[PDB]
């Protein structure tokens, strides 16, 4: 409950659709469930993914990467997850220490660009990995999986779900 609220608020302000991350985790767990001979669990998980994805298009809109360049199919790609990619040499120098101090202050005060620039110029690189989900295609995949599960076609449902996981596109973007 607490975690769910905390993650939703944080993700909302990061423009990340945690609801999509959760649908994909349901999918992941469904495939696991199948191969543990837990088809009832797999149904509950796939039905939950369906329910999450069924949130209306207007609600997904603020999370859509409208300028997404690498699409596997013509769809609206939603930023469903993201993470920090970071590189430095891990050797302390006074220039780096000063740069970190400056960047910390700038982050505390909301000067994101100044923080990132300051770190960059000191040899500390930081960007965002993004995970992009095709909204209508993933909806389709989950529905197809539901039907296969109803038919007892577990292995086949597992592969449709794998397909849905393989449709998540990885991208990188600068933080600003």
């Amino acid at each position: 409950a607490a975690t769910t609220q905390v993650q939703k608020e944080a993700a909302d302000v990061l423009q990340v659709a945690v609801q999509g991350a959760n649908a994909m985790r349901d999918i992941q767990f469904a495939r696991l469930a199948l191969f543990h001979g837990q088809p009832d669990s797999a149904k509950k998980l796939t039905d939950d993914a369906a329910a999450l994805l069924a949130a209306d298009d207007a609600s997904w809109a603020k999370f859509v990467k409208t300028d997404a360049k690498a699409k596997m199919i013509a769809d609206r790609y939603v930023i469903i997850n993201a993470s920090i990619a970071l590189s430095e040499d891990y050797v302390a120098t006074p220039e780096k220490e000063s740069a970190i101090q400056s960047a910390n202050e700038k982050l505390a005060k909301g000067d994101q660009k100044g923080a990132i620039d300051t770190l960059r110029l000191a040899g500390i690189g930081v960007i965002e990995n993004q995970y992009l989900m095709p909204l209508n295609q993933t909806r389709k995949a989950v529905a197809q999986s539901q039907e296969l599960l109803k038919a007892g076609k577990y292995y086949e449902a597992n592969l449709v779900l794998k397909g849905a996981e393989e449709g998540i596109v990885v991208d990188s973007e600068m933080l600003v």
Copy 2:
């Protein structure tokens, strides 16, 4: 009802989704810091600390007893897992029959029979597992909390990065 559905499913899969959630809190905290959202980073790291503070008895259900590799002397919890699958994707009657047989076996909860049947037909299926050192992740999160309080955001980010790097990847057969 996602929280409930995931908990019930993960409990019977011997996966500590509470651990996965703590790790996602950590992941989001690092993001938050670099978007100039220190109050959010605090909320997220405090939530990670709360989840991790669950008692040792509750974590024990999910502790891996056969881990061949550990970085630190600690209890490693299976906090996440996923299916690793390999086949040739060329349909044959022999494979299709094996699949039908496996499906029948899974319907009745016969995991071993299902996995053996698929393996004999050239369809491989095992588990990837993600292992979290319990006390070391507790320690890293507390350390990060203190650094955030001190305004040492970049440093807290690296402590959290180390916590993420402490997740050990493993594989195991489904049987």
Copy 3:
């Protein structure tokens, strides 16, 4: 008689026509193995591997230029990012249908004739998605990291050299692009 192994030549010729600088992938694998070697108590192997990375990266800028992603949008530092590795990302539902069977045959015939766009579009319309994952290496920063690691190794600072090399690996940016 089957082709004899000629891996360096085969990869180079193939990667050149794919706009992938396999020389960069080779430099990064050297780096990877150097870190492994350090933690096996093999400093000499680590030196040889890091020196090899340095030699590969020292290839002149003109030679790297055709592999630079000049429109790279996610950069950690201001640098020339080289496409050093790439792989196929593929998604389909694995359910055969007549429409997919026909589309796959058609795509195969198009690829036979080098009609990449037609093939990818045909697969796409049948629900078969295919794009490229790319691995982008900052040329000057990686040169710098490798040189720095060489100096640390000379000083016997093996753990530190390991972390510099780790940072070099962490400098590799992951991107995706449509195949056409």
Copy 4:
């Protein structure tokens, strides 16, 4: 002068002492590039790469033996799983302290003498974790998948060959191991 590149030799000699079959890594990179080539409408290149993989994998069973993980626990199929690639997994907090600095110096001294165990223990007890991620390739099954792909390519079944190769790649099992 600086060491000129001799990448295949340097990688082989290092991997041999590390018990990593780089020949396997090379075959898998050939397979990866072959899939890439197919989707660029380069079937001739895909053939050369797949043929090179076949040639590398055709190395005799005796030669693969020193790299077989005899006690592999997570097999997809009954096969000899070869350690074909490995990398360092490392975790620390990146906060310098006198205790960690001392431990790092001590670890470096121990690694200088080839004392892997002492070094790794020393780091571990200072809160620096270091293990190996290993990549395990089923030898017979991978040979089989490459031959099968070769036939499909001869038949112009490019998409299908791609998926057989994808399955070969999905047959690589990832494990972790203690350095020592």
